[PDB]
Amino acid sequence: IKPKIVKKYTGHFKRFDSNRFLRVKASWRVPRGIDNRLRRKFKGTNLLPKIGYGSAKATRNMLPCGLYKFPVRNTTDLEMIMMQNRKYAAEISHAVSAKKRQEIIQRAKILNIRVLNADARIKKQEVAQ
Amino acid sequence: MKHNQAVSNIHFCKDWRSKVHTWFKQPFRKIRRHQTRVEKAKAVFPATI
Amino acid sequence: SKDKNRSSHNQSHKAHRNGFYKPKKSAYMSTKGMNVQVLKNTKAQRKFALAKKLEAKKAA
Amino acid sequence: SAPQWFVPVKAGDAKVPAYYPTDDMIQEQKKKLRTRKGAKITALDKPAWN
Amino acid sequence: MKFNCKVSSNPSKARKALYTANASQRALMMSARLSKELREKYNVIAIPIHKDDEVKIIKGHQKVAGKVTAVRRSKYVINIDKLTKTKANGQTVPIAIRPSNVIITKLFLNKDREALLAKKAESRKSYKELVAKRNEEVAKAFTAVYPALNMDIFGKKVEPITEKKPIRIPSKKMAEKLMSKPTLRAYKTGIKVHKAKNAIAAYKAALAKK
Amino acid sequence: SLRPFVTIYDGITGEAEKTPVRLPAVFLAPIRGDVVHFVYRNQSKNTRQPEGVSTEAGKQHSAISWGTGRAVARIPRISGSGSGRNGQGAFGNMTRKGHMFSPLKNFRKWQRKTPKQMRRFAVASCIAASAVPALVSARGHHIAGVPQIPLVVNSKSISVIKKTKQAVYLLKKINAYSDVLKVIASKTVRAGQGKMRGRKIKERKGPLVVYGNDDLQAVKAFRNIPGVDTCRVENLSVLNLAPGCHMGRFIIWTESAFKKLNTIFGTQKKMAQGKSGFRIAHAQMAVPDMKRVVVAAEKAKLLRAKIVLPKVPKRANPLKNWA
Amino acid sequence: ATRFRQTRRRRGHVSMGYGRIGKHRKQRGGRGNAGGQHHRKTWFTTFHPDYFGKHGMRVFHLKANKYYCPSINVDSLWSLVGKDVQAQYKNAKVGEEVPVIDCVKHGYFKVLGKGFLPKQPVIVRARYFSEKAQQKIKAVGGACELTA
Amino acid sequence: AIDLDRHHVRKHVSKTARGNNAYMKLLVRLYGFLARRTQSKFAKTILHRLCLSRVNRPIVSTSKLACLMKKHPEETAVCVNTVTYDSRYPVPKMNVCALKFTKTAEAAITKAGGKCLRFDELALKAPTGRKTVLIRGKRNVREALKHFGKVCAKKNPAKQYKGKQTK
RNA sequence: GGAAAACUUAAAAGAACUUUGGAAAAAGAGUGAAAAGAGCUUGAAAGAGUAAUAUGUGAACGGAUAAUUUAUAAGAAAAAU
RNA sequence: CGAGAAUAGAAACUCUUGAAGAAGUAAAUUAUCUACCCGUCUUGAAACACGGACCAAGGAGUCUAACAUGGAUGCGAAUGAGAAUAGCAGGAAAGCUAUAACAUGAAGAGAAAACGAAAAACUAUGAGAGUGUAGAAAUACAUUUAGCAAUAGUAUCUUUCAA
RNA sequence: AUAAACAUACUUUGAAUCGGCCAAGUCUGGUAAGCAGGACUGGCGAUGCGGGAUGAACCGAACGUCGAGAUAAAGUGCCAAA
RNA sequence: AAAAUGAAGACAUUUUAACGAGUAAGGAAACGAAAUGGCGUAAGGACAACAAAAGUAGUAAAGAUUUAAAGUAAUUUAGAU
C-alpha cells in the first residue's frame, strides 16, 4: 500500500532577478524593496513561497518509494529501524567508507531493511570484473 | 528621553577608558599576600603576632 | 516651504478604533464638592452606625 | 514467538548478531503479493450482479 | 598531567624550540635504540647516534642494514651507505632516514661512548632499586590492612560484584519527566531497540530448544 | 521518612559491609533542571581569560577624507605617495587593514555572579539526579553492572589504594570499569580551529570519585585514568555533577564522603551545618505522582466516564438525498 | 546572549526597525537632559514636575550620622528575642523576672508604637520612645527604659 | 472577503504552567485532568491560578490566614502561592495548602498544631473541594504600581522615578 | 608618510638521453604513490579557447500550459470449486 | 392506497496499456497566454531622478556603566554579602567555606526644628462550597453558607501651612 | 427593535508616524489652473486582481495552493471569449 | 477558538468551525496541549556501536563541479567526477 503523493508546485521559487545577475544567487529571498515588482504581486511576477503550497501532512517528507529516509552510519543504527522496515529506508552517510558500506548493506538484507545507497562506492568490478 | 523614566546622571562625558581599573590581579594578590604572610610567620618565629 | 495647516481627515476613524471610552460607574458617585451640611449629616450617621456595630462585636 | 515485524532470512556465511537465529533453523517463506480474491464462478444461466 | 609551570604545553612553542635548537641539544634528540644483543651487554636502552655506527632499518620501504655515514643535525636525519638512490643521470645520492626508524646493532665506541654507557647503566640500576623501595612500602601498607591477601591480586583477573541490591527512591517515577525531548526520545528508542533484541533472542532460543 | 538503607561495598574483596547507611536527605531534593541551567550557564563562564584587540590596531594612520569632487567615495584615504598603500582606504570598519566594528575591549564582563543559595540549590538537585539510574544512563553512562547506583565503597579499601593498578582494580571490582573503557575507546580528536590553540583531544566523561578528608592520598592513583575525575565532597559544583548542562553524573562515593552528606547539606527539616543558611527545598508536590489521585477520585465516583468524540455526519442535501 | 537580540530577526529588513521616513539619525532632541526648558519641557512637566528650581535650605556639610535612627514598632519587639522566649514568660507579672528587649543591641534606637503587643509584661530598653509606643507598652503591663 | 470586526488573535489567557518546572507542569496536568472530568468549578479555579505568572500569584502571610480562618475552624486554606510568615503576630491552628511554604512559616504553622499541605494531597483528600477556603494575596501592594501614570496629574499622580537631582 | 608577498614532495628522487628548433621550448623517455613540473597542495567566480547539442526579422532573460527529443524511473507473482 | 411497528429477502465486477519503459519529474526547443530597472527618497519612478561595467573576499545596532518594565529562578521581613578580605583541598584566574561592614527593604511626612501610624476596622458587588426538584444525556431552576482578589466609598490614626 | 462570550473592561511596556495626495449631486481666495486652502466620507499612500486600449486615485471587487460551477463591472464583426 | 484525549505514539495529538491582502512597525529564548515556527556560519561544554574497543575517515576527510531527492522557503540529503 502506498498513498498518492501530491505536490502542489514542482518548480523552484528562484530569487527575483537571479536570471539576470550572476552576483544574485538563486536561493529565495523576500523582495523588501518599496517599488518591487514581485512583492507587489504584479501580473506575471506573482510567485512567492507561501504556506499554502505546503504538501499534505500524510505524505510530507515521503520518498518516491513510499518510505522515509533514516541516515545510518554503522550496523548498529540499522537496529533502530528494524521494527519499522515498512516505514523507514536506510541511507548510508556520504562519509562512510566502502568497507563499512558492505556490512551495512549485508546486515540490512538480513533485517529486511531497504537501503537507498545500495550501489554506492562499488569497487572496480564493472567492466571485465 | 521618551516615556516615563528617571533623569539620567552618568558621568561618562570624560575619558573613562583611561580611568578604567580592572581586577585581573585579584586572584594573584591573594597568593602574593598569603605567601608573604607565611614567610612573615617564620623569621619572627614564634609569635608573628 | 509652505505646508498644509490643518485637517480633520481620518480623525473620526482614528477616534473610533478604540471607541469612545465611557467613564465607569464610580465616576458618577463622587462626593467631593457636595453640600457641607449633607456631608455633616451623612458623617454623623455613619459614625453612629459604625460605633453601634462595633459594640455588638465586643458583646459577642 | 516471532514478532509480527520479524521475518528472518538466511545469511550466506555473513556475520550475524548474537540474537539473530542461525541458518539451520531458518525456513525461507515465499513472498506473498496477491491478497484479493478472484471473482466467484456462478451458475451458467444466472446473470451477474454487474 | 604536567605540574611544572616552567615548561610549556603549547604546541607552537614546542615546534619553535625544535627548529631553533642549538647543535648541543640536537645531538640528544637524534637518538636510537640499542639492539637485543647490545642491550644485554650494556643494560642501556638508547644512546645518541654516531658516525660509523651500524644500524638496521626497522620502519620504511627497505629494511636494510648498513653503516652510518652522516648525522645531519640540521635536518634531524642520518645517511646509510646501503640506502641510496641513483639521481637519474647515473650518480647516486644518500637517502635521509629519521633516527627513530633504525636500531643500533654495532657500536663505534672510542672513549666517551664507554664512559657514557657506564654512566647510563649505573643510573638505570639506581632507579630500578629506587622503585623497589617504593613498591615494598606500598605493599607493606596493603598487607597491614588485608593480611589475608597478597599484592599479586592486582595483576590477575577481576571478579565483578554480582549482587544487585535495589534502592527505593521516590524519583524513578519522575525520571522520564526530568529529561528534555531530545534525550527522552533517545532514551525511549534505546529501550525499544533493547527490548526487540531480547524478543529475537527469545525466538532464537525457543527454536534452538526444539 | 523511611530513609532506605544503602549498602557499602569493599573495593578490594567485593564484599558488602554488615552495617548499611541510611540514604542521606540530599538524595530526595527536588530535581529542578531549570534552576541548574540557570546556575550552570553562569558558572561555565568563570574560567574565561580576558581577551581583546590592540587599542591602536587600524588607527595608526594620519588619513583624512579627500572630500567630494574627485570621483571617489568619501572614506578616509592614506596620505602621502610612493607606495601602494598611499591613497587607499583608511580606518573605516569596512576597509581593509582598518579597525573593525566596535573593537573588543579586555574589560568585558568575563566572570558571572550567582547567588550562593541558588548554587547550593543547583548542587542538591544534581546529587539527587545522580541517584536515579534512568537519568544517569540517559546522560551516556554505562551503569548496567553496578550493584547500587548510589555506589559507596568501604573506606578501608580506599586507604590502601596507592597506585593506578590498584585504582583500576577497584573500578573493575565494583563494575565501574565499563564506563572507563567507554572513554578510552571513544577518545577522538577535536574538529575545527580549536586545534591550533592547543586543544586537540576530545574525551567523554566517566565516573566521578567523590572522596572525603581521610582519602586525600588516593587522589594520585585515580588522576591518570582516562575519563575519571575526582572531586572532594565539600567542593562539589554543577560543573562536576552536570557537565555540559546534562545532569545525572555517575558518582562513586566513599564512606567518609557519604557519611558527610547529612552534615554538609542538612535535611529537609534541619538546617545545613556545612552550608550555613541553606536548607533542602520541598518540591511543589510531596509525592510527584498523579496515579494515586486518579484512583482515589475514581473510588469516590467523582470522575465521569472517558468521552470518545462522536463522528460528525457530513452535510447532505435533503432536497436531493432522500435518505 | 546576542543570538536572542532583535538584530538577528531584522537581518534582511532594510532599516532594522527604525523607519524609512524618520531615519535612525545621531540625535533625537539633544544630548543628555538637553532642552529641559525649551523642547523637552512637556517631558519634564509630565514626569518630573519639580525638577527645576530650589526648595529648602542648604546644609553646607551634612552630618548624616546624626539623622541615623533606625525604628522598630511595638508589634515587632518580641521578634527580636523569638517566639520561644515569648511563650516562656507568657504568664509573668510584677515581682518575678521579665525578659528585657534591648533594641540598641539589635541596631534599633527609637521604638515607635504601631500595631499590637501580646498581653505579657515586657521591659523595652531603647534610646527614644514614641508617645503611643510608651502608652501601648505600659497598657500591656510593661516598662520603658532609656539608654545612652 | 467578509466584513469582520477583528481578526482571530491568540486569547490572552494562560493554559499551562509557565517555565520549565517539572513539578508545576505535573500539577497543571493533575488539575487539568480533575477540572475536565469532575467538572468542578473549584478545579477550574485552581487550574487557572496555576498558570498565572509569578507577579500575579502574590504571597499570603500567616496573619491573613489567621484572620480569614477565624470563623472556619475545621477548614483548609487553599492559596495558590507562597505562604510567608508574619513574625509580628501569633499563628493559630489551621490547615494550609500552598505551592510553597517559607521555612519560618512552616515551622510556625506546624508548632501550633496545624499542617502544611501541598496541592497533591489536597486533590487526594478534597478533589472537588469540600472544606476549603480559597485565598489570594493582595496585588495592589506592589511598589511598582506607584509609578504608573503621569506624576503631573491632578487626580492620581504617579510617584516620580528617582534619579538626578531628586528633591 | 609607508605597503605587497605563506604552502611541490615523505624524500629533489627537481626530469637530462634521443629527434625537431638559432634559441626558448616541444615530442618521446624517465623519477615519483600521485606531476604534485618549480608561475609547483586544492583550484571557485568574473573573462576566454576547444568539443557536443539547440535556436534566430529592430533587445535579451522570466512564468503558466502542452507537444517533440533526451534522461530518470515502476514487477515475479499468480483463478474458481 | 396505505406512515409507524412487527415478520423475511436478494452487491461484490470487466477491458486496454507498462523494464521493448507506465504514471510522474527534470532539461532544451517550438507554440498560446503572460512579463517595464533593481535599491532609495518621495503624494507619486519604468522614468528624461540619483547609485549600479563584471566577479570573489571584507562590510554596518556592538561593549561598558545607571535606571525601569517584563517573562523564567532562589530566598522571603528579609534578600545579597564572588565588599574588600581571610581560609581549604590540589599543584587550580576554576570550585568550596567564612554570624559580616554595608546596599536595597521592613515607615511615613516636613524646608527645617521637632515628630512618627487601629475603631484587633465598616459598606457595596464579587471567587468557591453544599442540598432539593425536574428535564432527563449533558444540563436547567429553587434554596443554605462563604465571603478572597479588584474597584469605589467610609470611619480611625502619622506628619505638613496645606492630604 | 437589532446585534454582541475567541463579548466586554482593560493594565503595563514599547515601535513607527505627524512632507501627504485624490474623488465629489461640497465651500472660500482667484479670470482660471493638473492653483492655494478647508467641512463629511471613501480611497491611494500601504493594493495586487477583472474592466475603462494605456493610467496611484474611476467602476467591480480586496489576495493561502488548487478543481468544478453560477456571477460583478462591462461586453458579444475581426484583433478578443461571447 | 472550543471540546476530547494525553508519559511519549508523532507529523507540534484527535475532531469541529471560522478565518489567510499589506509599506512603516511589532511579535527575544523556555513554557504538553507549549505566550509564532524554523534554516544557516563559527567556537566552547557534553552526548554519538551499551556485553570490557563505543560517531565517520588512506576500502579516501574537508573543499570544488554537476546529477537526483526531501522541504512552502530559508536549506538539507545522497550519487558521480
mmCIF file of N, CA and C (backbone and C1' of nucleotides) in Angstrom, chain J residues 88-103:
data_model
loop_
_atom_site.group_PDB
_atom_site.id
_atom_site.type_symbol
_atom_site.label_atom_id
_atom_site.label_comp_id
_atom_site.label_asym_id
_atom_site.label_seq_id
_atom_site.Cartn_x
_atom_site.Cartn_y
_atom_site.Cartn_z
ATOM 1 P P C J 88 44.775 27.161 54.855
ATOM 2 O "O5'" C J 88 43.685 26.182 54.239
ATOM 3 C "C5'" C J 88 42.811 25.444 55.077
ATOM 4 C "C4'" C J 88 41.905 24.557 54.265
ATOM 5 C "C3'" C J 88 42.575 23.793 53.140
ATOM 6 O "O3'" C J 88 43.220 22.621 53.600
ATOM 7 C "C1'" C J 88 40.573 24.777 52.354
ATOM 8 P P A J 89 44.736 22.306 53.182
ATOM 9 O "O5'" A J 89 44.592 21.138 52.112
ATOM 10 C "C5'" A J 89 43.793 19.998 52.385
ATOM 11 C "C4'" A J 89 42.980 19.593 51.184
ATOM 12 C "C3'" A J 89 43.744 19.439 49.882
ATOM 13 O "O3'" A J 89 44.455 18.220 49.781
ATOM 14 C "C1'" A J 89 41.809 20.711 49.488
ATOM 15 P P G J 90 46.000 18.232 49.342
ATOM 16 O "O5'" G J 90 45.970 18.755 47.837
ATOM 17 C "C5'" G J 90 47.133 19.313 47.234
ATOM 18 C "C4'" G J 90 46.793 20.376 46.218
ATOM 19 C "C3'" G J 90 45.655 21.326 46.604
ATOM 20 O "O3'" G J 90 45.908 22.628 46.074
ATOM 21 C "C1'" G J 90 45.154 20.301 44.562
ATOM 22 P P G J 91 47.247 23.434 46.439
ATOM 23 O "O5'" G J 91 48.278 22.975 45.316
ATOM 24 C "C5'" G J 91 49.376 23.798 44.949
ATOM 25 C "C4'" G J 91 49.710 23.679 43.482
ATOM 26 C "C3'" G J 91 48.544 23.885 42.514
ATOM 27 O "O3'" G J 91 49.018 24.578 41.362
ATOM 28 C "C1'" G J 91 49.549 21.797 42.105
ATOM 29 P P A J 92 48.782 26.158 41.217
ATOM 30 O "O5'" A J 92 47.309 26.264 40.636
ATOM 31 C "C5'" A J 92 46.983 25.701 39.372
ATOM 32 C "C4'" A J 92 45.512 25.832 39.071
ATOM 33 C "C3'" A J 92 44.844 27.092 39.621
ATOM 34 O "O3'" A J 92 43.832 27.511 38.713
ATOM 35 C "C1'" A J 92 43.738 25.197 40.452
ATOM 36 P P A J 93 44.104 28.734 37.717
ATOM 37 O "O5'" A J 93 42.948 29.767 38.064
ATOM 38 C "C5'" A J 93 43.021 30.595 39.218
ATOM 39 C "C4'" A J 93 42.250 31.875 39.018
ATOM 40 C "C3'" A J 93 40.972 31.728 38.202
ATOM 41 O "O3'" A J 93 39.992 32.649 38.678
ATOM 42 C "C1'" A J 93 42.462 33.193 37.085
ATOM 43 P P A J 94 38.913 32.178 39.771
ATOM 44 O "O5'" A J 94 38.404 30.774 39.226
ATOM 45 C "C5'" A J 94 37.558 30.697 38.091
ATOM 46 C "C4'" A J 94 37.190 29.272 37.776
ATOM 47 C "C3'" A J 94 36.350 28.561 38.822
ATOM 48 O "O3'" A J 94 34.974 28.874 38.743
ATOM 49 C "C1'" A J 94 38.154 27.184 38.235
ATOM 50 P P G J 95 34.210 29.429 40.038
ATOM 51 O "O5'" G J 95 34.092 28.164 40.991
ATOM 52 C "C5'" G J 95 33.443 26.980 40.559
ATOM 53 C "C4'" G J 95 33.616 25.872 41.563
ATOM 54 C "C3'" G J 95 33.216 26.203 42.989
ATOM 55 O "O3'" G J 95 31.820 26.110 43.207
ATOM 56 C "C1'" G J 95 35.329 25.169 42.999
ATOM 57 P P C J 96 31.111 27.041 44.305
ATOM 58 O "O5'" C J 96 31.634 26.457 45.687
ATOM 59 C "C5'" C J 96 31.261 25.158 46.114
ATOM 60 C "C4'" C J 96 31.949 24.789 47.401
ATOM 61 C "C3'" C J 96 31.753 25.752 48.556
ATOM 62 O "O3'" C J 96 30.512 25.603 49.217
ATOM 63 C "C1'" C J 96 34.031 25.228 48.378
ATOM 64 P P U J 97 29.781 26.896 49.822
ATOM 65 O "O5'" U J 97 30.573 27.180 51.171
ATOM 66 C "C5'" U J 97 30.803 26.141 52.106
ATOM 67 C "C4'" U J 97 31.835 26.536 53.130
ATOM 68 C "C3'" U J 97 31.556 27.820 53.885
ATOM 69 O "O3'" U J 97 30.628 27.624 54.934
ATOM 70 C "C1'" U J 97 33.822 27.770 53.201
ATOM 71 P P A J 98 29.860 28.870 55.584
ATOM 72 O "O5'" A J 98 30.971 29.563 56.486
ATOM 73 C "C5'" A J 98 30.668 30.702 57.271
ATOM 74 C "C4'" A J 98 31.919 31.457 57.630
ATOM 75 C "C3'" A J 98 31.794 32.971 57.644
ATOM 76 O "O3'" A J 98 31.203 33.494 58.825
ATOM 77 C "C1'" A J 98 33.718 32.360 56.427
ATOM 78 P P U J 99 31.547 32.910 60.285
ATOM 79 O "O5'" U J 99 31.492 34.203 61.209
ATOM 80 C "C5'" U J 99 30.716 34.226 62.399
ATOM 81 C "C4'" U J 99 29.774 35.404 62.417
ATOM 82 C "C3'" U J 99 29.249 35.790 63.796
ATOM 83 O "O3'" U J 99 29.004 37.196 63.826
ATOM 84 C "C1'" U J 99 27.440 35.166 62.417
ATOM 85 P P A J 100 30.206 38.237 64.066
ATOM 86 O "O5'" A J 100 30.024 39.299 62.893
ATOM 87 C "C5'" A J 100 30.163 38.909 61.531
ATOM 88 C "C4'" A J 100 30.218 40.102 60.611
ATOM 89 C "C3'" A J 100 28.918 40.901 60.500
ATOM 90 O "O3'" A J 100 29.225 42.286 60.338
ATOM 91 C "C1'" A J 100 29.565 40.149 58.366
ATOM 92 P P A J 101 28.149 43.413 60.735
ATOM 93 O "O5'" A J 101 28.611 44.692 59.911
ATOM 94 C "C5'" A J 101 29.622 45.550 60.413
ATOM 95 C "C4'" A J 101 30.263 46.355 59.313
ATOM 96 C "C3'" A J 101 29.335 47.233 58.494
ATOM 97 O "O3'" A J 101 29.014 48.453 59.137
ATOM 98 C "C1'" A J 101 30.788 46.055 57.054
ATOM 99 P P C J 102 27.514 49.023 59.087
ATOM 100 O "O5'" C J 102 27.177 49.106 57.534
ATOM 101 C "C5'" C J 102 27.709 50.141 56.722
ATOM 102 C "C4'" C J 102 27.679 49.762 55.264
ATOM 103 C "C3'" C J 102 26.320 49.817 54.592
ATOM 104 O "O3'" C J 102 25.987 51.120 54.154
ATOM 105 C "C1'" C J 102 27.362 47.760 54.090
ATOM 106 P P A J 103 24.455 51.546 53.949
ATOM 107 O "O5'" A J 103 24.033 50.835 52.591
ATOM 108 C "C5'" A J 103 24.622 51.204 51.354
ATOM 109 C "C4'" A J 103 24.036 50.412 50.213
ATOM 110 C "C3'" A J 103 22.519 50.372 50.162
ATOM 111 O "O3'" A J 103 21.980 51.501 49.502
ATOM 112 C "C1'" A J 103 23.368 48.180 49.958
#
